[PDB]
Nucleic acid binder design. Structure first.
Ligand code: GTP
Ligand code: ATP
Ligand code: MG
Ligand code: ZN
Length: 353
DNA sequence: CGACGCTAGCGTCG
DNA sequence: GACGCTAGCGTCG
């Protein structure tokens, strides 16, 4: 018996006018920005643009509130070392060396000039509407802010792409084999991984973090175990729809419940990483048939619940890293969310309404 | 430039 | 209400 969630999907879906209004300005800022950066004999003249994040993978919710974009530099002969046997972070050992310090590139050193350039470049158009948000320490992305027409943010991430084989941390991860098959799985691994300037502790300046944003986007585009899943000549799965609700449930919790100390740590990547685990858990399209929507979402929420209690949410690409690890997040934070979702699951999801 | 797939929005319904 | 058009954006060359 319908919750009914389908209405919830309808509420969530972006305005066609909304996107077009938002869309055209975003590319315009990025395309111009890209063009000017390429022209200048900066190190970043070589930059190529990669579009990633929710909107582009098409799981954006309510409104085009935010955009994520990646600027990738192809870097050759790269060598790298793990900071402290942490799957996410490495420093790249090593020809433009201005940013480099001590034969190892400094993200902080490298990022700072990049952010500096954008700020300089943004100043040219210098609309009151367009500005660069103040740096947040431990943030690797320069953030554009557009006050026209409405408040919206675009995240620019500097990207170093390596044609090298994926790091050892990766290999156990990404078990799409049952779901998507070895051929597909093997092909994904062949595509290059990316490096971004995030640092684990509490301080660090020259470490980097791996990004598989391009890979995640790819699998989201092609979730189906069948080639035709969600195609015109194929049955429609509800996987993407399941994801939106999950994204929506959490976001509604922060806002509607109201922000709390425990709530802040949790972010949309956790649901997305969690959702993938379920897809691995359940690799058949028949299981995800649209008419079967209601159970799956429940199945989706249940898994998330288990994770919080278990406190184990291994990174999809890196099994070793636990997103839900206590050092990453304290227990009381888990409990509270757990209960609220717990409350939510039993009560028929009023928060959506 | 130019294909096409995807999705929002809407008309028809055999 | 399920189909099935349309328009428009995103994408890889
Ligand atoms: N496109 C992309 N963006 C990333 C990636 N990793 C981190 N970011 C960016 O990092 C920003 C937020 O920083 P987080 O990585 O989430 O770290 P955090 O623990 O939440 O702390 P904050 O930096 O303050 O947000 C986001 O806007 C992301 O765009 C990635 O693999 N791909
Ligand atoms: N904490 C994180 N850890 C690791 N990777 C991340 C993290 N946070 C964000 N990313 C990368 O960034 C991309 C987008 O992250 P971000 O939260 O900024 O936007 P989004 O989740 O895709 O969109 P939305 O606002 O709707 O949730 C993801 O696809 C992922 O690859
Ligand atoms: Mg996003
Ligand atoms: Zn599907």
């Amino acid at each position: 018996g319908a919750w009914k969630l389908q209405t919830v999907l309808e509420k969530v879906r972006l305005s066609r006018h909304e996107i077009s209004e938002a869309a055209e300005v975003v590319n315009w800022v990025v395309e111009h920005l890209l063009r000017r950066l390429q022209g200048g004999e900066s190190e970043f003249k070589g930059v190529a643009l990669l579009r990633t994040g929710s909107y582009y993978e098409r799981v954006k919710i309510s409104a085009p509130n935010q955009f994520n974009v990646m600027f990738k530099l192809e870097v050759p002969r790269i060598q790298l070392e793990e900071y402290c046997n942490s799957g996410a972070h490495y420093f790249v050992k090593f020809p433009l060396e201005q940013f480099l310090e001590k034969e190892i590139l400094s993200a902080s050193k490298m990022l700072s000039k990049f952010r500096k350039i954008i700020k300089e470049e943004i100043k040219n158009i210098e609309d009151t509407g367009v500005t660069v948000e103040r740096k947040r320490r431990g943030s690797p992305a320069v953030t554009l802010l557009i006050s026209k027409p409405k408040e919206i943010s675009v995240d620019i991430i500097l990207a170093l792409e390596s044609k090298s084989s994926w790091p050892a941390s990766t290999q156990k991860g990404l078990p799409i084999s049952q779901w998507l098959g070895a051929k597909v799985k093997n092909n994904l691994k062949r595509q290059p991984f990316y490096l971004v300037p995030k640092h684990a502790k509490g301080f660090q300046e020259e470490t980097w973090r791996l990004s598989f944003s391009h890979i995640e986007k790819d699998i989201l585009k092609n979730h189906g175990q069948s080639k035709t899943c969600c195609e015109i000549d194929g049955v429609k799965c509800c996987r993407k729809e399941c994801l939106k609700l999950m994204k929506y449930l959490l976001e509604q919790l922060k806002k509607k419940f109201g922000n709390r100390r425990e709530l802040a740590k949790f972010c949309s990547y956790h649901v997305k990483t969690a959702f993938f685990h379920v897809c691995t858990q359940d690799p058949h399209d028949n299981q995800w048939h649209l008419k079967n929507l209601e159970c799956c979402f429940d199945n989706c929420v249940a898994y998330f619940l288990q994770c919080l209690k278990t406190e184990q949410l291994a990174n999809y690409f890196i099994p070793g890293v636990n997103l839900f690890s206590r050092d990453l997040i304290d227990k009381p934070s888990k409990e509270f969310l757990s209960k609220q979702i717990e409350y939510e699951r039993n009560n028929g999801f009023p928060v959506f309404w």
